[PDB]
Amino acid sequence: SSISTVDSMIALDIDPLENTDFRVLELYSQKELRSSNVFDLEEIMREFNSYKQR
Amino acid sequence: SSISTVDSMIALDIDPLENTDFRVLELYSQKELRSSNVFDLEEIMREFN
Amino acid sequence: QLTFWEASERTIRSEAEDSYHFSSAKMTATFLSKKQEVNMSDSALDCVRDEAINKLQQIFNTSYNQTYEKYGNVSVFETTGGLVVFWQGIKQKSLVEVHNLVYAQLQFTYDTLRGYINRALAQIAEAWCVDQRRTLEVFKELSKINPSAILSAIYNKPIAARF
Amino acid sequence: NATHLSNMESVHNLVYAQLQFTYDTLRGYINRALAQIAEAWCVDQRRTLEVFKELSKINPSAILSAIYNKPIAARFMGDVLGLAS
Amino acid sequence: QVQLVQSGAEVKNPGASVKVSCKASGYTFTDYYIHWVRQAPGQGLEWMGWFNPNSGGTNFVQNFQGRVTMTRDTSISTAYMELSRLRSDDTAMYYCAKDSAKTASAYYGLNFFYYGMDVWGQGTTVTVSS
Amino acid sequence: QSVLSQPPSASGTPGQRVTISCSGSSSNIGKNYVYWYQQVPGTAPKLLMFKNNQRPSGVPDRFSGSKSGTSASLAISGLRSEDEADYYCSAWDGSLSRPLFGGGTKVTV
Ligand SMILES: *[C@@H]1O[C@H](CO)[C@@H](O[C@@H]2O[C@H](CO)[C@@H](O[C@@H]3O[C@H](CO)[C@@H](O)[C@H](O)[C@@H]3O)[C@H](O)[C@H]2NC(C)=O)[C@H](O)[C@H]1NC(C)=O
Ligand SMILES: *[C@@H]1O[C@H](CO)[C@@H](O[C@@H]2O[C@H](CO)[C@@H](O)[C@H](O)[C@H]2NC(C)=O)[C@H](O)[C@H]1NC(C)=O
Ligand SMILES: *[C@@H]1O[C@H](CO)[C@@H](O[C@@H]2O[C@H](CO)[C@@H](O)[C@H](O)[C@H]2NC(C)=O)[C@H](O)[C@H]1NC(C)=O
Ligand SMILES: *[C@@H]1O[C@H](CO)[C@@H](O)[C@H](O)[C@H]1NC(C)=O
Ligand SMILES: *[C@@H]1O[C@H](CO)[C@@H](O)[C@H](O)[C@H]1NC(C)=O
Ligand SMILES: *[C@@H]1O[C@H](CO)[C@@H](O)[C@H](O)[C@H]1NC(C)=O
After folding, report:
1. F32–C16: do the CB atoms touch at under 8 Å?
2. For every residue of C85-97, which 3-state class applies, written as one string?
3. Strands D73-76, D81-84: parallel, antiparallel or unpaired by DSSP?
4. How far is the CA of C93 from the centre of ligand 5 (A)?
5. How far apart are CA C132 and CA C21, in angstroms?
6. Which residues in chain E (63-92) have CB-CB distances under 8 A to chain F?
7. Is F65:F72 a contact under the CB 8 Å cutoff?
8. Contact, F47 vs E2, CB < 8 A?
9. How far lies C6's CA from each of C98, E63, E115, in Å?
């Protein structure tokens, strides 16, 4: 125990790359995509049908 | 001769990363994307015509 | 509400900290699913349950010979992208022997690289250790002749020591 | 062997090409770096083998034990080392 | 506020059954799983099992299997656990805890997983004495 | 095997830092989160860390968390009079398919 030991190891502790769960990023929701159009076909057809059935 | 030979070659054989040909994955075909709409403009215009 | 998209064989599931990765080389895509399974006996899967189970049985009968055996029960997962995954583990017997899915490929890139690197470097590390061990013994024997030189080399500083 | 145009529609997003480029670049760099490292390792191991051979003339037992990671008692008998118990 | 309320202290004789009620408040009772845990008066926590308010399924450790009857009341938003064949080792405090794992996703119902018992009940002391 | 082990007690001084360890296995803590619960004596247990490190709302900033492979660590700084409580680490174990609790690291400060 009085004597010391010469550590002769050149450490190469390389930390492994950690896992990464990629997000499913969504910029514009479906509501915004539907609201991005001035002319909505469904509404136009509904108004035309209302005209017919009036 | 008939003498053993010391094997002192620390093998470091790192198999290379094999090539990957990424597919062009198709989830919804064009037919499904065209049929996903209740109101088809072409059919409406044909009916009006 | 569910239609068959594609059946993949030899899918590799890896359990991460929070999600399962269903890597598939045939699709070159990895799908992430949250760790809690979708209840198989649900009312929304009624129109695809029989088809999915039959397809799994057919694939097991066709693409796997007698070496492999079933494992687990058919488990339903809901991936982060909205897809639904039916999973049936396979194991070798012992002593008997979004409209655009680029993200799905992108994950398969990372897991293909992050994995390989984490093995490659690891091999090097192990090899390094072995070499270092041998080198230490060299030092010991070469410490018999000129201890001072060996110690100066090890500690990178002029040290005087006799044998 | 020449084929004919098949009239398919081009993919709009065009991120798949960039992903393939990423994979190819990373794979090439990793392979080159690991090949370089393997070659340098081989050269260093050859030099270490020669060092082992020269140190064998002094203490064969220690060198052979280090090489085989187990107690090995060997004696020096000239150009060849003799193993024993 | 999100909270759970449990019944008061209870004393039972061995061989009898004891019912513990867990009433939720401040959140939908049929959204999250319910962990049932037990701790001795002078010992650490000990998981008993999980219950699904939305579907009624439950699973308990083999020690409590067969001995536990699980009922629910969506109108009162209260889960009842009845433990039968009491022994002298069941004198302890029983906790009900809301889990962070939802019982149903946006479309489908989900199985059980452990995502942390964020909300805990006040705890019910149950004594088994002769 | 599939059991969790943590030191049975810990101590310190006010204004100092005390670290509580939680050793697991290749399963559970190895490939799952580590949730940290606090239990003041005489009261019902509470949640203290709802992820590896992430801290819930209302919990004092003094508490910090860390995960390293098969082990986890909770660092408590300040160490006031209200931090004297039991600290249980828990993790889902896939081999047993069950949450697992430790034994309890009683803070005697
Ligand atoms: C997944 O969903 C299914 C159905 O949606 C759940 O199965 C249901 O489980 C409950 C609780 O175990 C069953 O209720 C019990 O059934 C038996 C009938 O013999 C009876 O002893 C009890 O009085 C009680 O009512 C229910 O019948 C059963 N339903 C079906 C269709 O199987 C299942 O629990 C869900 N999985 C989960 C929540 O992990
Ligand atoms: C897979 O499903 C089978 C049934 O097809 C399950 O087997 C049952 O397991 C329970 C629990 O031990 C037994 O009480 C039953 O007798 C078994 N058979 C049936 C027909 O219910 C099995 O547990 C499921 N899971 C796995 C992982 O195999
Ligand atoms: C490209 O197509 C042209 C037209 O089909 C080919 O030219 C002829 O190909 C036919 C076979 O289809 C041969 O019999 C003729 O001799 C070719 N030449 C002429 C002048 O008619 C041409 O060979 C094709 N190119 C390739 C590389 O296959
Ligand atoms: C697979 O083979 C088994 C064993 O004969 C049979 O019961 C099962 O129906 C088969 N599955 C198919 C053909 O999909
Ligand atoms: C069955 O398939 C596995 C998959 O690689 C293969 O190793 C094995 O040899 C096959 N069985 C036989 C009998 O060839
Ligand atoms: C933030 O402060 C806390 C106080 O407890 C300390 O423990 C922690 O190390 C600090 N963060 C950094 C990044 O130094």
Report:
1. no
2. EEEEEEEECCCCC
3. antiparallel
4. 12
5. 37
6. none
7. yes
8. no
9. 15, 44, 31
